[model samples]
Target: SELLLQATTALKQPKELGYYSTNVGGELKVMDESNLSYYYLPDADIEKHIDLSAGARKFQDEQAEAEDDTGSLHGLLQTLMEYERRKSKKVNADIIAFRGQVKRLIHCAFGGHATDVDMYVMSFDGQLFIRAARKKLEFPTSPRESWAYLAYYSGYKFERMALLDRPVAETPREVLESRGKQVVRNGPQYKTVVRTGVGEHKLVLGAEVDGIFDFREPTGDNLKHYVELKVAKKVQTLKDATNFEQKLFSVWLQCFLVGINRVIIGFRDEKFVLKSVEEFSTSEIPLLLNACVDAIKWYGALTKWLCELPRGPEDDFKLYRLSCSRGALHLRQLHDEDLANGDDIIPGWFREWRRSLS
Candidate 1:
């Protein structure tokens, strides 16, 4: 089936990359949302080291001393503080890496740009992830001392994006099963439609000018065509403690290149088509692209601060949401403060991001 075949290519369905080509239309759904954004940390979930004994000792001393010094209590407090600090640093490092990946993708995709891209982090449940908007300079850092990790993949709930005004046609599992061996040999257009049906719904599996093909259509006002390419942890190369880190970083960089390429081609094509049909360019895409880069660079620096800073477990991070160049950039909405109360809420970066986008 062309759809299934195309899907394998679109997702690079390699076990090594944490993705697989399913038998159902060869549909490529991410194993988890965290897989999509590449923000997942294996150590974050496993039995990571927690210095509770030290913390306990400090607390006991602090209580027993009864002085301003707070002896063992102080030690316990300090030990716990250090643990929290390490956690915060790890979280921040992930954010910085996430945003940096975004910027690199934009630059690689668009070819050349003088400005930066505006970035914000958004969370759906309780994770922190990055979002790029605006065409100018914009950035923020957490002052409260901590943030959460919201992965783009995991944070994105398919059901949310699929809630549309009109529901799309549903392809039955039985039909897909029966035609598992079907092959598409027709022209590209017909081939693509078939491919989506047989493999991934709404997945356009071919190399267009953008060098990639994918789109989303709401099934109804309440339903979006939820799709994702989740990376897997089963892959030894990615999970290997020896060389996994660098390899993971490389894969991320490559994905960014694809994203940037798509964006640049998309913007350029849109501009060209508009000018060709309307006899003039929009006169703003160029500026918008530059502003986007500038914003990205600025946010890159800001995120670094969060990663490099220290924090306690109880400490909260304050994110200054930035939205600039609304005229040139595409913005939907913005957030005020959700990660500020010092609870286990979504990170500030994500709160600001989801709101900032329309």
Candidate 2:
């Protein structure tokens, strides 16, 4: 189905909603950068000599424990609400969502992946909220299934090696090395809520930021100083380079949506050991995408479709399921009984705040 969308530029200024950290005990949610880490650019002339697989056995062998029930935005809205309660300026938005929900559709336009992605989009008080569709559990229950789990964990482990809890300049090298090897369960998250756009499809977006660039020069909520860290296998042949390019396309859309400008990739060997690290510019990413500019046209149509999404009676939390088909987005209305977390889909506290305003 051919859809209509205006000529829109890429995402706009991503204002900071401040930083938030999760997975702590005795706190509802911590609104600080305690979980935030720094990635100081290492010496250019020195070989990184990084060993990401330094602690793999105990890492891969640990029994899985039940983790805390984290929501889609990953403490994003909770942080916003807390800020609102503490007298931060209330946002006037037409749309609200985490970057994940939106990223899927954006990928679809690029013909990146033709996968069935679902979400709950709510229309309330003249604004629409997009949230992840509650999914059926899928994971390792058998020895054979564990490899997939370990592969996922490898990415996290790479971050463990690359990120420092504090400024590395203030930390001793021994301490930094010690911190990298220690396995952390339910590590903290630092997510940003940005007000960006697709033409007039302005939205308040929440995206998890991997780390800060250098402590010597503070970012002060500027995306220019923020970094997006990614782990990848060493690219060797033409096939490897092609697959890696595809991966870069995915990463570009991710950082593009949240307005993150810098990306640092950790290249690993066959055994998942860090071999080298390289930097990529967020601006240069466009050249790669525009060369495949079909992505631009596809992304444009979807954003306009979202901005003009149909609605239902106010406050009923009408949810729409969006999927990919025929190079377009398929929107379906789900029953109220299908609601996963209406409380999350439309927080009662936020409802009262809107009522008070009315």
Candidate 3:
């Protein structure tokens, strides 16, 4: 007993939700990268073999859950809602969330594949909201302590080895945290929030960035300067190459969503020994996607699936657990007692933000 293939091959149209509207027969709008917030990652280099697992146990990566939980969308809402209040304008969107969630959804649409997780959803004021705290289930058979899990720690080490707090060229004068500031804990990160739409589902994405490639050029051009850092193993076999191509969906989409065109990857060997570095510009991403993946079909289907969610009595702050699989998906209305009786899902101030204003 399984679900039927209810998937579609339509891509959602993505445009930044900014101070502009589309005119018929004219070009689609894109907000300038200059105007977007610029979170700078320090200029870094891989001078030698990096020990990515040296202090993984001690210097644990920052937890996305309770540790620094963006104060429950307050980080994004504060900047966005305040702008609306001050300017006497309002944000119009179907949904709001970090890029990862959307990325996860779109990934499913790409192939109509596996998407199993408990995603907290709330409907308020005609707007659907999602938090990055996607409560995914962990089976006894998983990657918590496996060799496959080593890459998670290894990736963190790559960033520490590759980047310093400030650019290398900076004067000993403009000091921030010298000595890469202990890569143990992934220090404070800078972020930029952008608004976009995929078909009928308008979205606001608050994405965390890695770092920039330079310091001398202060233009803060996201496409020109921002580089996604990584430690990828060198390919040897045809299978490895094929897997590498398949990996581009995650790699390219992460940058493609934000219009970042550059990726700086460090190549390691079979023994996990660091060897050299390489780069991949996203300009060819769409072109590469064109041959195999039907971009338009995927996005349109994504919008269709999102719209299929049953609306729960306008602005009731209702919650749904959207679990996904190949082809079709499932939506379960949760009990009030679930998620601490809906405590962290919706905050009082957020409710008032809409209520007091209306």
lDDT of 3 by residue, 1-358 (tens): 1223332342233332322111122322222222122223333424445555556446543442223343255555555566467656667767777677666665664553464433667777667777645433222233434556556666666666665555555435323334334544443445556666655566777665566665324443344566777777778988867666666657777776665667777777765656677667876656654522544355445555555555555546777766676565456667666563444766667667767676
Pairing residues by index, what is the TM-score of model 3? 0.73
TM-score of each: 0.23, 0.84, 0.73
Model 2 CA deviation exceeding 4 Å by range: 1-11, 24-30, 41-49, 60-64, 67-74, 83-90, 135-150, 177-180, 184-186, 216-219, 288-297, 310-316, 337-341
Say which candidate scores most in TM-score: 2
Range of the 10 consecutive residues with the lowest summed lDDT in candidate 1: 186-195
89 Cα displacement, candidate 2 (Å): 5.6
Report residue 17 deviation for candidate 3 (angstroms): 8.2
| Residue 246 of model 1, lDDT score | 33
Each model's total of backbone clashes: 64, 0, 14
Model 1: per-residue Cα lDDT over 1-358, one tens digit each = 0000000212212111111111112223322111111111122212232111111111211111222211011111122223334444222113211223343333432332324544443333222334333322221122211121111111111111111112223434443332212221101100000011111211111111101113322221101111112221222343343332333333333332222211211001111111110111112223332333343343333333323322332322433332323222222234455433422223344434333432
Where does candidate 1 stray beyond 4 Å? 1-93, 96-101, 104-116, 121-129, 132-311, 322-358
The lDDT of each candidate is 0.24, 0.66, 0.55
- Candidate ranking (lDDT, best to worst): 2, 3, 1
Best by lDDT: 2
lDDT at position 107, candidate 2: 73
